[PDB]
């Protein structure tokens, strides 16, 4: 019931520019992790170097400059060095972090894409969702999208089921999670309702357990096999921004607009602990008064270790104890 900082990274023009981190993700083996955001670059870090080096030294091993602000990253689960990005122009790109080059650009979305996800079980497949109200499924072997879903509202988040590339969870601005069987997109297989605002994130704890976040200041747990609402989590403030959601088999973690990371155990509806970002030199670069928010989080897949980042560009590695 405590969070502890074991590493902190401030890299970039932190005090003179915008540095919101929109996405932070470990690669397939939890060896590297990457950040992306409004500063128009993808940074790749070596996790072991980060947690074992001295501070004021932390730097990425790779920095890839991009044309547009980035909204999301997803590492490929089979080609370890491949990573997908979505950006504010709608473009979905797959990069090689070793050569620092783009491998493929998918340019069908007409508006900002919020989310991308590489499938674990069919690893050539990539799904994206956008303000243009479309879900698009891409195959890295092909130039055009292979599936398109015309939806009624902005798509804020997309995620493949971890056990099957035939199912995706889709978080919509219409306040619902649309759970699609991609073999028949005529209608969603299930629609989960209960949130009072847009569904900003969807993440699977398992093949049948799905978590969601919403700007109604709740996280919610669902069973996508039994088509049931399971639990609602409250205690954090999230009425406006994308503040991050990450889950493992037992815990849900999210950001907040009070510059705080929260951790929930999946069976308890109040937070078990939290960590508060912020520092003297950012208090009066003024405005931890209300403006700073956590903006991305990601559990390590094999440890109670959490990557975290906020709207000022600070990255922390936390451990749960």
């Amino acid at each position: 019931s405590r969070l502890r900082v074991i590493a902190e990274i401030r890299h970039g023009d932190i005090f003179h520019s915008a540095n919101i981190v929109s996405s932070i993700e470990f690669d397939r083996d939890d060896e590297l992790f990457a950040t992306a955001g409004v500063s128009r670059c993808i940074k790749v870090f070596d996790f072991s170097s980060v947690v074992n080096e001295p501070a004021d030294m932390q730097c990425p091993i790779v920095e890839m400059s991009t044309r547009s602000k980035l909204s999301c990253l997803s590492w490929n689960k089979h080609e370890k060095n491949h990573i997908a990005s979505s950006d504010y122009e709608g473009i979905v790109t797959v990069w090689d972090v070793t050569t620092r080059q783009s491998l493929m650009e998918y340019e069908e979305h007409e508006k900002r894409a919020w989310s991308v996800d590489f499938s674990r079980t069919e690893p050539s497949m990539l799904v994206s969702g956008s303000d243009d109200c479309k879900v698009k499924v891409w195959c890295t072997r092909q130039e055009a999208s292979v599936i398109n879903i015309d939806m009624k509202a902005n798509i804020c988040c997309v995620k493949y089921n971890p056990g099957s590339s035939n199912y995706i969870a889709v978080g919509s601005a219409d306040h619902h999670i649309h759970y699609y069987d991609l073999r028949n997109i005529s209608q969603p297989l299930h629609v989960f309702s209960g949130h009072k605002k847009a569904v900003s994130y969807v993440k699977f704890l398992s093949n049948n357990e799905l978590a969601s976040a919403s700007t109604d200041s709740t996280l919610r747990l669902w069973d996508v096999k039994d088509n049931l609402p399971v639990r609602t989590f409250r205690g954090h403030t999230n009425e406006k921004n994308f503040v991050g959601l990450t889950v493992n088999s037992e815990y849900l973690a999210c950001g907040s607009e009070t510059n705080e990371v929260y951790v929930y155990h999946k069976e308890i509806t109040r937070p078990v602990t939290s960590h508060r970002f912020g520092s003297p030199d950012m208090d009066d670069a003024e405005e931890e008064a209300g403006s700073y928010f956590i903006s991305a989080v990601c559990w390590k897949s094999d440890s109670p270790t959490m990557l975290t980042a906020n709207s000022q560009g600070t990255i922390k590695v936390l451990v749960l104890a």
Binding site: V38, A153, C156, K197, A198
Partner: peptide, 8 residues
């Protein structure tokens, strides 16, 4: 502003 969740 950036990273704001759309409303509908």
């Amino acid at each position: 502003s950036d990273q704001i969740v759309p409303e509908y």
